[PDB]
Automatic annotation (TrEMBL), chains A, B:
Protein's UniProt name: Gp6
Parent-record interval covered: 264 to 303 of 315
Length: 40, 40
């Protein structure tokens, strides 16, 4: 039901069905003097 | 689900729940000369 990803189309109006992948996480970086990268 | 507040914003496109409380009541008054009011 409803209208997720609000564009203006009901799921029961167009008979469409939504598929969801919710996940809340966190990313912390203690220091940056310890990582080296390789750029072109 | 849906958009109960009818402000466009749906409840699965903004990740928000709705808490609602509905009731049906009536108020009838047989008279008015049987009530006094203390006014400032």
């Amino acid at each position: 039901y409803g209208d997720p990803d609000q564009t203006g189309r009901d799921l029961k109006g167009h008979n469409e069905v939504m598929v969801r992948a919710e996940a809340v996480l966190y990313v912390a970086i203690e220091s940056l003097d310890s990582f080296a990268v390789v750029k072109e």
